[PDB]
Design a protein around this motif. Structure first.
Motif, mmCIF file in Angstrom:
data_model
loop_
_atom_site.group_PDB
_atom_site.id
_atom_site.type_symbol
_atom_site.label_atom_id
_atom_site.label_comp_id
_atom_site.label_asym_id
_atom_site.label_seq_id
_atom_site.Cartn_x
_atom_site.Cartn_y
_atom_site.Cartn_z
ATOM 1 N N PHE A 1 0.818 -1.209 0.000
ATOM 2 C CA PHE A 1 0.000 0.000 0.000
ATOM 3 C C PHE A 1 0.854 1.263 0.000
ATOM 4 N N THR A 2 2.074 1.199 0.537
ATOM 5 C CA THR A 2 2.957 2.356 0.429
ATOM 6 C C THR A 2 3.399 2.564 -1.015
ATOM 7 N N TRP A 3 3.597 1.471 -1.762
ATOM 8 C CA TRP A 3 3.871 1.586 -3.192
ATOM 9 C C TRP A 3 2.674 2.159 -3.941
ATOM 10 N N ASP A 4 1.454 1.781 -3.542
ATOM 11 C CA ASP A 4 0.269 2.311 -4.211
ATOM 12 C C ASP A 4 0.203 3.825 -4.085
ATOM 13 N N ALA A 5 0.593 4.355 -2.925
ATOM 14 C CA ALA A 5 0.577 5.798 -2.712
ATOM 15 C C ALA A 5 1.504 6.546 -3.663
ATOM 16 N N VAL A 6 2.492 5.878 -4.251
ATOM 17 C CA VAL A 6 3.416 6.530 -5.172
ATOM 18 C C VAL A 6 3.259 5.996 -6.594
ATOM 19 N N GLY B 1 -0.618 10.622 5.052
ATOM 20 C CA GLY B 1 0.468 10.940 4.147
ATOM 21 C C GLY B 1 1.536 9.862 4.170
ATOM 22 N N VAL B 2 2.150 9.637 3.015
ATOM 23 C CA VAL B 2 3.271 8.718 2.873
ATOM 24 C C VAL B 2 4.463 9.574 2.469
ATOM 25 N N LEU B 3 5.358 9.839 3.421
ATOM 26 C CA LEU B 3 6.590 10.557 3.117
ATOM 27 C C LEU B 3 7.354 9.800 2.045
ATOM 28 N N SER B 4 7.592 10.462 0.921
ATOM 29 C CA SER B 4 8.166 9.816 -0.243
ATOM 30 C C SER B 4 9.344 10.630 -0.755
ATOM 31 N N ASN C 1 -2.981 11.356 -4.874
ATOM 32 C CA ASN C 1 -1.774 11.974 -5.401
ATOM 33 C C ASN C 1 -2.037 12.739 -6.689
ATOM 34 N N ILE C 2 -3.297 12.857 -7.099
ATOM 35 C CA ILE C 2 -3.652 13.459 -8.382
ATOM 36 C C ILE C 2 -3.203 14.915 -8.403
ATOM 37 N N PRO C 3 -2.889 15.475 -9.576
ATOM 38 C CA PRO C 3 -2.379 16.858 -9.627
ATOM 39 C C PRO C 3 -3.303 17.887 -8.995
ATOM 40 N N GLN C 4 -4.606 17.610 -8.916
ATOM 41 C CA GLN C 4 -5.568 18.549 -8.354
ATOM 42 C C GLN C 4 -5.406 18.740 -6.850
ATOM 43 N N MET C 5 -4.620 17.884 -6.186
ATOM 44 C CA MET C 5 -4.500 17.947 -4.731
ATOM 45 C C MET C 5 -4.010 19.310 -4.266
ATOM 46 N N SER C 6 -3.075 19.912 -5.007
ATOM 47 C CA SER C 6 -2.545 21.209 -4.601
ATOM 48 C C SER C 6 -3.628 22.283 -4.628
ATOM 49 N N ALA C 7 -4.467 22.287 -5.667
ATOM 50 C CA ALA C 7 -5.569 23.241 -5.718
ATOM 51 C C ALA C 7 -6.596 22.967 -4.625
#
Ligand SMILES: OC[C@H]1O[C@H](O[C@H]2[C@H](O)[C@@H](O)[C@@H](O)O[C@@H]2CO)[C@H](O)[C@@H](O)[C@@H]1O
Ligand SMILES: OC[C@H]1O[C@H](O[C@H]2[C@H](O)[C@@H](O)[C@@H](O)O[C@@H]2CO)[C@H](O)[C@@H](O)[C@@H]1O
Lengths: 437, 437
Positions: free
Chosen positions: A93-98, A261-264, A333-339
């Motif tokens: 699941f940590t791999w899934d997060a990245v 969050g998964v520190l990556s 992790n989708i690009p929209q997360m920042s917005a």
DNA sequence: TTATCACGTGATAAA
DNA sequence: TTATCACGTGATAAA
């Protein structure tokens, strides 16, 4: 900065164990001769997409996984291609997060979730619900203390309360997140934030409280409770506070739902050090001794490495963290997360201050979190269109000025030329520009 | 934040002894019941003029004296009116640093000057000139070390080298500073900055080095020299580095001329706590025990209080600081100082990076440092003028649209209306707007 | 000093 | 989606 062949430069947040990570870099340098500089610049998660678009930036960047998909969409990260044997050392699941668009875009390091931190001496029996906090504050205020202080400037710390009664960021349906379906404006979101604002209006919390203010008040024994992640534990260890880490309080009988969050660690796509960064990450950092040196500095949380997490999981503070992480959700992790994060940050700050009501702040946050960012070409289409509109008009006035013989003054704006053109066509123009035949 | 009657909120820079100042606030609270919160928000010297213009901001603000005159011109500071007996406890020249237009605008605390800090073990004999640093770096690089690292992001740390050969900020003539006479673009200024850039081009220094990067490299024994103020000494004390503080190196046979700062405390003009802030500053902070608690946290430099400075002056590190301060100049406090610091900051960063040559960076810095900031009314005059210019034109096109019968399309820009007006007056307009009779 | 036009993105909306 | 006009400050210059 630009990265150079033969050296490694790393960016990691200032609240993480950068001194411990520098020890790992020093051992790397001892065995390969490659110098490794660990830096913690302010707002690194914002500077990296700016500098990496032209080849600048560090070799490796450390951040929670929610930012990396936006980096990948912009082509800033090198694809992570570890051997199957190494992937097996980390929890799936940590791999899934990245994983973004089928590709691994970073190495996962640690799983982070907010928990409730409380002073055992001032508060041996921590509360279980958010609703009983206002009364608890009344008791502690008479002693010269406060109930709870946490970071109100970053929506990460407030989101567990917003998400408890049903507020969500992006809906997940049929295998994907729908970016047009934002749930920061529903009844569950409004109820959580209204309770937050109500805590400030009733003088139980300060709208301006930030990270350092909340950290100091708890570590100095002035407040009985704070909300923070595992990175903050080492500062409380050195202080005289005897603290416990437990589950977050419920709201409306529902558990607080922190965003996990998964520190990556991602490798810059512009680094001529990809193999060295891959070697350092896989064979030096993501080992027991490497994660230990970092963890002893500032605790990492539940590390992605199975062998070392079997050791760390015995820590009851880590078990509470996992308990909270199970109640929450892994971040997209989708690009929209920042917005999404910007819009909620503005909504929380504006409502806590009183600049906006809860209804208005969340309604605009929902519009902003779903707002499509216009492409560079769209911006360029608008710029050129207005440039062309002015150029046509400029030519027209250039011709009228040079050929009209309009009995103009020495200096006049193009409006006076247009006025002269109107009377020549048979119009009357008043001073405010009112015109008729 | 807004300040409230009965409590004291203080802002002080994060590199100063805020924990020690909080101890003084706790003793204050013990003897008066007034709670005192010490906060160190980022860029406080920039946030204060923004928030204090509407009554927000802290009760007390701590900064070097160079910023306070701009605060006074904007009406943000309460006039400081200490008794004659209390003024005598402080050195007259520290009072001069906080005198603006004949009035005392802050309490002076400590005199700060940059010095040369060096590792005695790696470099028992520190250099005396800037010119012998490139060769010294060549020796240390072969050992795996560097010669000198200091903050290149803030022009405070670079100004001693710029000012050595004759570069100056504002000329002082006949009793006043001339704000139109800026000397950041003379031969003395160009020579100092060119040597700085030359250090980067020859790989002796990194353009991106900042405060934390330079502090860590020196405190970890990776570089032999740094340039910093007394506040940084306590971090080196806890480290394993055996260090000395001495005079800054000469450049072109001339001493480095650091800009001397007087850490000062101003009272917000909007605080209903002026008497409490005056009491806390005069009777709690500016005492031996009060300055001691702050100094033991992060050293203050040469404190303004005569009784405690007679103790501190025995410290050879303080004597070196004074030695450097005597070679430098007390900063102006005039409102233009902020525009001077911004312009030089951009000039140093742009030349160190290579975005601009030294000549171009300093030429623009001289123009910017003297640029008169336009008044609010001047900005408003321009806004209204352009608003009126558009309103006249809008009316004209409104009349032509409703009364022209111009055989227009359903939707068209006002340029198509103007074109129709041209043929009605007897003109020919081409597509790019080229027009003739 | 005041003045003109440029400039790129925002507010608004037809489709 | 593309479209129009607004918007306030910048670039430039007459005086
Ligand atoms: O508050 C918005 C912020 O939330 C998260 O940031 C966390 C980070 O994950 C933690 O490691 C720690 O540093 O606290 C941060 C909040 O200050 C998201 O990861 C981040 O993208 C987002 O902007
Ligand atoms: O670099 C520009 C900056 O220089 C001075 O700031 C000093 C400050 O005086 C010191 O106390 C310490 O904090 O280092 C600062 C530089 O980072 C000026 O006082 C300040 O106004 C100016 O912006």
């Amino acid at each position: 900065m630009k990265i150079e062949e033969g050296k490694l430069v790393i960016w990691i947040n200032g609240d993480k164990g950068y001194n411990g990570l520098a020890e790992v870099g020093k051992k790397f340098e001892k065995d390969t001769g490659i110098k490794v500089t660990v830096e913690h610049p302010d707002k690194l998660e914002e500077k990296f997409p700016q500098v990496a678009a032209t080849g600048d930036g560090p070799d490796i960047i450390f951040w929670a996984h929610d930012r990396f998909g936006g980096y990948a969409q912009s082509g800033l990260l090198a694809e992570i291609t570890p051997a199957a044997a190494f992937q097996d050392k980390l929890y799936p699941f940590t791999w899934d997060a990245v994983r973004y668009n089928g590709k691994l875009i970073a190495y996962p390091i640690a799983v982070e979730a907010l928990s409730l931190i409380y002073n055992k001496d001032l508060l041996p029996n921590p509360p279980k619900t958010w609703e009983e906090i206002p009364a608890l504050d009344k008791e502690l205020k008479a002693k010269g203390k406060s109930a709870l202080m946490f970071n109100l400037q970053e929506p990460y710390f407030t989101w567990p309360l917003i998400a408890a009664d049903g507020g969500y960021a992006f809906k997940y349906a049929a295998g994907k997140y729908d970016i047009k379906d934002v749930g920061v404006d529903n009844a569950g979101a409004k109820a959580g934030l209204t309770f937050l604002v109500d805590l400030i209006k009733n003088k139980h919390m300060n709208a301006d409280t930030d990270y350092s203010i909340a950290e100091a008040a708890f570590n100095k024994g002035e407040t009985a409770m704070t909300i923070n992640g595992p990175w903050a534990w080492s500062n409380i260890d050195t202080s005289a506070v005897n603290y416990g880490v437990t589950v977050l309080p419920t709201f409306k009988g529902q558990p607080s739902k922190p965003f996990v969050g998964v520190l990556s660690a991602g490798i810059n796509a512009a680094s001529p050090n990809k193999e060295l960064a891959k070697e350092f990450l896989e064979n030096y950092l993501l080992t027991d001794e490497g994660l230990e040196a970092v963890n002893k500095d500032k605790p990492l949380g539940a590390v992605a490495l199975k062998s070392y997490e079997e050791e760390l999981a015995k820590d009851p503070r880590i078990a509470a963290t996992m308990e909270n992480a199970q109640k929450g959700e892994i971040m997209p992790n989708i690009p929209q997360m920042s917005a999404f994060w910007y819009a909620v940050r503005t909504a929380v700050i504006n409502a806590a201050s009183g600049r906006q009501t809860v209804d208005a702040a969340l309604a605009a946050a929902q519009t902003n979190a779903a707002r499509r960012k216009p492409s560079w070409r769209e911006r360029e289409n608008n710029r050129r269109r207005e440039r062309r509109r002015r150029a046509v008009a400029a030519k027209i006035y250039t011709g009228l000025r040079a050929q009209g013989d309009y009995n103009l003054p020495k200096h006049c704006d193009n409006n006076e030329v247009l006025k002269a053109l109107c009377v020549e066509a048979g119009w009357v123009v008043e001073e405010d520009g009112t015109t008729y035949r």
